[PDB]
Structure formats: C-alpha cells, structure tokens
Design a protein around this ligand. Sequence first.
Ligand SMILES: O=P(O)(O)OC[C@H]1O[C@](O)(CO)[C@@H](O)[C@@H]1O
Ligand SMILES: O=P(O)(O)OC[C@H]1O[C@](O)(CO)[C@@H](O)[C@@H]1O
Ligand SMILES: O=P(O)(O)OC[C@H]1O[C@](O)(CO)[C@@H](O)[C@@H]1O
Ligand SMILES: O=P(O)(O)OC[C@H]1O[C@](O)(CO)[C@@H](O)[C@@H]1O
Lengths: 315, 315, 315, 315
Amino acid sequence: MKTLGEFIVEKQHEFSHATGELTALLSAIKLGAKIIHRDINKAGLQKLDLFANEKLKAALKARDIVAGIASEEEDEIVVFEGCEHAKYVVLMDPLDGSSNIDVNVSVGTIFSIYRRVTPVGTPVTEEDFLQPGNKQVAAGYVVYGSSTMLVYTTGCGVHAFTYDPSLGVFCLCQERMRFPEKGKTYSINEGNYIKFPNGVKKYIKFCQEEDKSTNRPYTSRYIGSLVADFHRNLLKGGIYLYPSTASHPDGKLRLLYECNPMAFLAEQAGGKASDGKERILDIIPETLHQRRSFFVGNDHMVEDVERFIREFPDA
Amino acid sequence: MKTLGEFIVEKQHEFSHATGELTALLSAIKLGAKIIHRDINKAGLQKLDLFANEKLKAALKARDIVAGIASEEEDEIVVFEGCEHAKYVVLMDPLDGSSNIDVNVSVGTIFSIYRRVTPVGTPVTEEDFLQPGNKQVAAGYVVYGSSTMLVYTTGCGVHAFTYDPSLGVFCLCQERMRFPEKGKTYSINEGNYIKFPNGVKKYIKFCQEEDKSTNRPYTSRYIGSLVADFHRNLLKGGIYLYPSTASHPDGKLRLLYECNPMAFLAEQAGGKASDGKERILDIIPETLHQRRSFFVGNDHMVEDVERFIREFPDA
Amino acid sequence: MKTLGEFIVEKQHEFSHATGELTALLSAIKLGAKIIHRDINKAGLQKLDLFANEKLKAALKARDIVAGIASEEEDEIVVFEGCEHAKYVVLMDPLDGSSNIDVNVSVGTIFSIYRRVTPVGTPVTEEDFLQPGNKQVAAGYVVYGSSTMLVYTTGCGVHAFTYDPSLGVFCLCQERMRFPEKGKTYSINEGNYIKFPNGVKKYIKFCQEEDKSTNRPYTSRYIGSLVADFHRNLLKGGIYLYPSTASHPDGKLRLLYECNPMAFLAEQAGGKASDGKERILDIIPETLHQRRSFFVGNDHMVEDVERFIREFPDA
Amino acid sequence: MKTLGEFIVEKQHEFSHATGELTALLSAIKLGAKIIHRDINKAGLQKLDLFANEKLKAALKARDIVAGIASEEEDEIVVFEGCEHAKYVVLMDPLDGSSNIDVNVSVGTIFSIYRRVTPVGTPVTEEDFLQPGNKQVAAGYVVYGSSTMLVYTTGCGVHAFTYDPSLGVFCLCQERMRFPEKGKTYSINEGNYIKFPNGVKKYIKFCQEEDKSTNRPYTSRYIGSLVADFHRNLLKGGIYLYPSTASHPDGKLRLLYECNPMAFLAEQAGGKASDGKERILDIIPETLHQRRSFFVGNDHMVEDVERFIREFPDA
Ligand SMILES: O=P(O)(O)OC[C@H]1O[C@](O)(CO)[C@@H](O)[C@@H]1O
Ligand SMILES: O=P(O)(O)OC[C@H]1O[C@](O)(CO)[C@@H](O)[C@@H]1O
Ligand SMILES: O=P(O)(O)OC[C@H]1O[C@](O)(CO)[C@@H](O)[C@@H]1O
Ligand SMILES: O=P(O)(O)OC[C@H]1O[C@](O)(CO)[C@@H](O)[C@@H]1O
C-alpha cells in the first residue's frame, strides 16, 4: 500500500520538482475532502455548497501556501491576508452536482491550480485567475460516491487515490488512468433535446443507430454530476456533453472552475476536451464566471461531435 | 435519534403484529448491508455480486427465521437445512447495478419477503416463491451511495434509515416517504431508442416538448442502478422506465426479484408500478426468472406512459 | 465470523430458552455501548457518567422489554411507564472508572439482569432490585479500551465480543473465557495500605515474598477501572482487591451494581468472588446502595486472602 | 478545530524554523500511528511489536527525510539506503507496553528525533544515535487508549492531538500541557518491593503515610504501560518510577528509546526526569541498549525520591 503523500514524495519529477509545495496543496484539498465527506456521509442524519466552500477556503488558507482563491460560489476572488507571499492560486467548484446531495447520489469537488503571474508580496488579481487552461500546473477532483476518491494530475498522467475509512488515509489505487481504446457510452441531459445545437442532435441520433461494427447503439448514462459522469467515462470509456441550450446560450459549465481542470485531466488520460470547435485549454478567458459548451471524453467520440457540428452548423 | 430496531418495536401494528419476527428479518438484511458496504466502500483498495449473494444468504440462514431464499444470482431456490420450521421466504437481488461497482457509482440491494404457502416442517418449493407481488408482507432496498441507507415497507408507508458510521447503527431519517405531487424527471436508457415500443418513443418525445404549464421539457437522469434511480425519483418525483427492447423482448428486469418489491414500495409511497398495461403486483408469475417491462414512479407519469402505449400499440 | 446476535440465536439452551428476550436485552446494551463509545473515543475533541446513564436508560426503555432499572447514579429505582408488563429488571453501573475518562485510560459499563419478583402489570419495587446475586439471570460488562468489547454470561460460560468499527457490529472473539490455572498478578490500590485490614496487609506481603516455586513475588497491576482490571486478570490470571478502608468502612464497591455481576462472571469463568469471608452471590441485600469488600479472581488467590483474614482478624 | 499539520505550519518558530521537515517527520509518525491503531483496535477480531516496528520503519523511510533509525526491537541501527542525504535520525520504542495488547489495555509508541552528527552523503553511525538526551530536537509518543492521541515537543511546550475517526485526522486538543502544581499519585510495580533500592522503599512508605496536609497517603495507579502511566500523571499530576531490581540491575527502561524522550517531554511540561541522582537528559550514552533507573513526573515528587535515595543509600 502507498499513500498519497508517499506518492507525492516518490514522483519528484512532477510539479516542476517543487515537491514540498505540492504536498501542502493536496494536503489542504484532502483535508477539505475529509471534512466534506463527513457531512455528506451523514446527510440524512444551497447548504452543503456553502459548507464545502468555507471548509476548502479555510484549509487552503491554513497551509499558507496559496495567495488567493476563486470559487464558483463567490462573486469576487478571495485574497488571503497574510499570504501575499504565496505564489499559487486556486480556482474551485466546491461542490459539483448540487442536485444530487439530497438524493444520496454522487457529487464531487473540482480544483484547478495556477502559478500566479502578478509579483509576490503584492495581492493577487483577477489577472492571476483569468489565465488559459493550458497554464494550470495542477488539476483534479474529489468524488464522493460509494467510496471517496481523489484524482489529480500535474502534467504526467492521471493519478487516483481511494480514502480508506479503516485508516483515515488516501491510498493509491491507480497510478496511470487512461481512457480505454474506444467508448460506448454518451452522457448528456436528453431532456434538453429540442434546444440542442443541430449538430449535437445529429450526433445523438448517430449514437442511437444500429451498427454493431462500431458498438452502436451506445449506452446512455447520466448521473447529473459532472465529476461522477467524467470518472465513469474515463474508466469505462465514453463522452460527456453539455452544449448550449435555451437556458444556457454559452453552455452551463464554467470555463475556469469546471471545464479547464476536467480538460487538463481528460487530456492527460489520452482523451480530448472541446467546446465543439476549439480546444478548451487554449481559450482565453474573458470573465471570471464565463460559461462554455463542453464535450469531453474519448478522442474519437469528441471528434465525431466536432464533425457533426461542422456538417450541421447553426442549431 | 431513533434506531431501526427501536422503530420496529414502536410500530407494533405493522407486519401483522409479529414484531419479533420483523426484527430478526431486517437484522439479517442490515448485517448483510453492513458487510457489503464494507467491501464496496473499499473497492479501489461478476465478483461483488457473488460476495453480496453469499453474505446475504448466510445472514438470513443465521437468524433461523427464513425457510429458504430465491436469488437473482441462483438458478434454483435455496432451501435452508434445519429451517424447515421457518414460515417466511425471501427473494432478493443481492447487488443491483452491476455496471456501477468499478466506477464508484451507486448500487443497491433489493429484497422481497413472502409468507410461505407450503406446510411448515416440510421444505419450501417454487410454489412459495411464485406468488404474486400483492402477497408480499415486506419489501425494501439498500442503497450504497454517498451514504448507505435502508428503505422498506410492510404495507403502512415507506420508511428510510441512514447508516451512521460514527455509531455503527441505522437511524430513522424519514418515516413516511411519499412521491411529491408531480414529477419532472424521466429515467430510461435512451441509447436503446430505436428498439423501444412505439408508445414509449412517443412518451419520450412528450417529455421533451416545451410546455412550461406542465414543467416540460422534463429533466433526464439515469444512473444505471435501479435502486439509485428509484430512490431519487421517490424523493424528487420522476418515473423510471425499462421497456422491452431488442435484447430483452420481455423487458430486462426480473418480475420477482426487482419489479414486485419496488412496485410494493412505489405504491406504498403514493406512486404507481406498471408493465405498460397491467399492475405489476397482480401479475401471476410463471417462472422464477420471468422478466417484465417496468414503469414505476409518480402516478400521473406512469399513466401518461400507459396512455401512449394505448394510442400507439405495437412498437 | 459470528455476530453477537447470531450467537444469541445459536445458544438457545441459555437464558431459560427465552432467546427472543435475550436479544432485545443485549441489543439495548450494545446500542448504549456504541453511543457511549462514540463520545469516549472523541473525549479530547461527573459528565460522561450522566451521559452514559441517560443513554443506557433510554435504550433499555426503547426495547419495551425491561420493567425498570436501578442505577449507581440514581437515588431511587426507575420505573418505566408503559412497561408495567415487562418481566425483567436491570441494575447497572453506567460508567465504571470515573477517574479514567479524562486520561484516556480504560473505563467500562457493568450491568446485572434479574427476573422480577413482583406481579406483572403492576409497577416494580425495590423488592425486585434487592434480590441476592445468585438470582441474576444475566450479567456482563462493556470495556472501552484500545478496542471496545462486550462480555456477558447467563449461566453457561463467559462470552466475549469485540466491536468491529469497519462493520459497526460486535463479533465473537472468545466463546468460553476461563481464568488460567494460576494467577500471578494482584490488583489493589496500595496507597490505602495503612488502613487495610491486617489480613490483607499480610496477603500483600505474601504477594511480595520471593518464592519462585509459587511464582512469587507477583506482578502489580492497577488500572483504576474495575472492568479493565477484571478483564485482564480473567485473561491472564490474577486477583482484584478492594477491602474496607478509612474512607470506606464497608468497602467502596456497590454490592448490587458492581460486586454481584462481576461475581457471577468470575464464577462462570472458574474463578471466585468473596467479601473476605462469604460468597458475594449469597449475600442478602439490605439497601439499594449497600457497599461491600470485594475479592475476585483466581480461586487459589481469593482463598489465600480468605485464609490470611482468618489467621489475622481485626485490621 | 485545528489539525496537527495546520498547527505545525502555525508554529514556525519551533524546530529551528525548518517547518517543512517537521511536517514530513510527524507525517510519518501519524501514518504509522494510524496503521498500528487499526490493527490494535481489532486485536480480538511478540507479534504486534514486530508489526508496529516494520510499519514505523517503512513510513519513516518513505518520507525520504530520515537517514536511519534505531529501534528497541533491533540489535543494530538501520541505515536507509538512498537516504544518505537525510540529516535526521530517529530512535523509537515501536510498541511500549507489550504485556497490554492481549488484555485490551492501553499501549503506546515512543519516538525520539536527533539531528545527525556525521556528514551528510555518508551513512549514519551509532555515533549519531549515542547522543545525550539534551540534544534531541523532537520527542513524543502515541497512546492507543479509549481514543488514540499523539503528543510531542520540539522544545517549546508539550502539544497533544486526538485522532478523530469521523474525519481520519488528528486534531489539537491541548496546546500547552503542564503538570499540575502538585501530584498525588505514584506509579510503580510494587510487586518488586523487596528488591527495590532502600531509598525507594522509604519513599513508598512516605507515600502511604497519613498527612492530609500534603495529600498523603497518595493514590496508587499502575497501568503497566509507560506511555499510559506518563500521560495520566502529566494531566493529573503524579510520578512514575522504575528503579533497579533483581531482574534489572540498571533499571528496565532503555535510556535512549524510552527515558530520554519521555524526559524531554516531562521537562517541557514543567516536570522532572531523573535516574535517582542525575538528570536523565545529561547522561552520556555508552551503548545502544543501555538501561537506566527512571523517576519522572511532578518535580517535588521526583525530588522527594532523590532525597530518600540520598538519606538511605545502598538498597
Ligand atoms: O441539471 P442539468 O442541466 O443536467 O446540469 C447538470 C450539470 O450541472 C452540474 O451539476 C453543475 O455544473 C454538473 O455537475 C452537471 O453535469
Ligand atoms: O445497462 P442498462 O440496459 O441500462 O440496464 C440498467 C438496469 O439493469 C440493472 O443494472 C439490473 O437490473 C438495473 O439496476 C438498471 O436499472
Ligand atoms: O480510586 P480508588 O480508591 O482506587 O477506586 C478505584 C475503583 O473505583 C471505581 O472507579 C468505582 O467503583 C472502580 O472502577 C475502581 O476499581
Ligand atoms: O512488567 P513491569 O516489570 O512492571 O514493567 C512494565 C514496564 O515495561 C514496559 O512495558 C516496557 O518498557 C513499560 O511500558 C512499562 O512501564
């Protein structure tokens, strides 16, 4: 058995070799993950979003390693007083899958870590949080399901750890997660069908056609939690889609707090992350809460989606 | 706080007032639930189906309260040697949602309890397991999600309990679960679209139409675990569908191990359970592993499905 | 692995064959044990005595199996309203080893169960609680140490179970506990030396003499918790002593809440329990809070104590 | 609530301000503590000494922060291959209180940390482990009792943390532990009376005299585990004694693995640690497994012991 902290130490080559800092950063994350897990694993016994938000903020501030954070739950960025010396910033989706807490269905936490651009000693600015996904030095998520797992990458593969309640520690369970050769599952809220872009509706149809030669029709799975749907598709192969709709002209997901980190992860796993046309990681952010269409998963599936959008433009 | 065992004692009027027996029966179930939960909550650290199966069988035999069991994992019924005196039989789906174990997604256990028809002292026969759903004296499920819960009914409402890891006991969290007034979510594997009965495809379309007056289009949620999808729809309102397809001419779900218990539960919660035409609970079983189309959830939604099937017969 | 409840079922011959009742009784005890354990295992994170007291009382009342209880923490007996039909009474030392809670040292719970003498339907009276130890139908203790264990007897051996935090259940770990052939440890608060009866001081000296032929000098162990000292001496052999002193003319331990149950246990394990002269179990109680000198453990050691008291009377 | 790791960060002034290293060191310790706790909390469900030994060694090697270790269970010192660059060495008593594991009585782990004297890059030598107690830069213990706690010091007070099973993390419960103004408990194995040094026997007598003005006679407590007896005496006041006997001419405790660390702790808490004549921390070690008489606890009590030894020399 190998713990997360022991793995961090063992993989010196990652994170620009600043091993000491990576341990402090993830230590904050897992502590928050342990705390949130505790409240969630006893939910029965707009509320937990705030709790997760506060717990993660406080833990990150307590390691005196982060200069400030950006949260999907907050309007502005949060500058940690006394941490003007820190050189890292974190963006996070404290609790992804809000509609799943009360139903005892999987939810998760997403985090994205960037190295600040603004001078140390001084206070961080939106400038530090509006960097393109391709500049992240770290990203990952925590999934609170039948078991609680932490998954992350720094640019050298996707590593997964499982919390062992018997010990109270996270243990390595998979060192190099990779999408399988092909996918056969699509995850999308088909309820919003009529309002989907025409190219996406064509793709859906494609998925439902009978062609055993290509494993079609595909299987449909949609948990309602991006972290949970992503996790499954990475292990079993599949694609997750959330295009623009009536309610969300520019998609629903936040580009900075959700799209980029999951994109950095999908890619490090051999997958692909797109907004239907361009690479999510190369998009230049314009606002802190900018949303974006998201298509992530097996490369061939995302490509298919991209192709249908091409051949069938304008919803 | 009130435990499951203390609730059993307090609700003497239920289970034909044979309180002592109900406690032994559920004690077996929760023990199995605790054991399975342990292996599942540490899965990372066709396999668990067998483990759950053996654990539940052994626990039920150890209470010397059940005469024999029928399992979805077994070809024949299991007669408990030395229990020919027992007067109850149990049918069970040890682990529902096989495709979810490896992905850390919710799975569950389903159980159905009948009073034997064959004379005590003698060994139980399929006759005891081929009774119609409306004769069950008890039914329920265990859902292993962000938290582990046990849900059951004996004919007087649906009761839910949450496992408290801090104590190692199940506590009441909801004494009378009821479907809300209306539902706005449909759960079905849309991947199998083209092969669905024509009436179901029409219903799907119905669900996707824009009519704010009726909360349409509906939301789409499909976890892939019947227990998890059912649980959510009961708390939030919704319908779960699994019609006949190419792969499953008579639906996929087993009538005795899955349909009947969930049906007894849906009904006790104010919902409705149908195979598209008739009431699941009044169907006379023909074989031990008989499958059946299943439509369960809010009454108005099931009725809609029934109506479309009527107006659009033959797939 | 075998659980406590499964062991209860398997040993039908015990408890006058009223198996159903024994399960309800111990179920109350272990629930209280689980609850107390939870608060104790997080003490750091005259107070717990009250908490343990209330929790045990409530659990016993909730099984609707006990008519009333007598507690070392209470002045009077407690009559359970609505339980006038119950036919069992319980005496208990909710938290034995008060001076050990704050220091993270072992403490325990002791319980004694009698069948009532007064007519059912009517309310129990002190008469039901002032019966001699030899009439107990059940007795045992819970020890909260490095691990939490429940130990009990109904008159057919001493059975021990260990709480498995991984499962949240008590498992059999020893079905027939017996004192070893000989003991080599004495447990007494030697601080109260000068005030000990002369016969006891002689015995102490005896214990400290050099005579390898008899394993002397003996080892001295005194945890300060009767349950913890008893437990060790039963597994490893030894004697526990608490004679009369300046502060306690009639010993410190309560005859009904501490002496009798531990005596019933010592005896069932092949040991012996005395007040220095007579058998604890045959003493006729005079008051609810009557105290008594106590000498329990390996038979040969208790006999030695009895002999010195004889040869050296009057402190 | 504040975690151990967050406290480490907050107390930068300690450990020569090399905060990053202290976190890695204690991280190893607590991981070992979590692992051992797991096996101990399920002992029922010469053996654990070895298990604790291996687990602690491996954890320390995995942080790549220690150059080598000295264990009470090992004949020679252990040089960590690949860690010749490390600049810290650790001496440890993996499992203190061997005679307590099987009886579910408290046991603990003791550790002592020194900065190496030999050149980095090269392999550590006994020279690095034979330094006097006053050169330790860190010391502490883990006590596995009703709850599991970690206690340590670097020279600025004694800090205690309690493991929270609900979270799987150690939380601060006491930042500055100090012996109370006076003590009233003595901990010694009085079984070895006749062979004790004459001065110690006089002290024992002293402890048993009646003099309410000085809280005499004192209370006697002896758990059999040095870590557990020490812990209690520090919280409640008291003295722990283990003089030379027939079996142990130079006392039983090891000077390096037990005496020094506990001494560094006693002192940092306002107490005193002596071998009956000189200060334990200033003794120059001669051998790796050198034993020594030990008298630790409230300063006035140790002084009394020292005085009686003076006035009554030669056993
Ligand atoms: O309810 P909808 O429209 O399907 O949105 C679900 C999506 O929203 C989120 O809950 C929040 O971004 C995602 O986790 C999930 O994929
Ligand atoms: O993979 P499919 O065809 O969607 O089937 C999923 C269904 O099968 C089961 O896993 C087994 O009955 C159900 O729990 C679930 O609803
Ligand atoms: O503090 P003392 O006088 O040694 O008494 C300790 C005894 O008192 C109790 O704490 C209470 O009866 C026992 O558990 C223990 O054996
Ligand atoms: O069995 P004895 O001689 O009292 O020795 C007990 C002492 O030995 C140890 O178990 C080992 O050093 C200590 O923890 C304890 O204080």
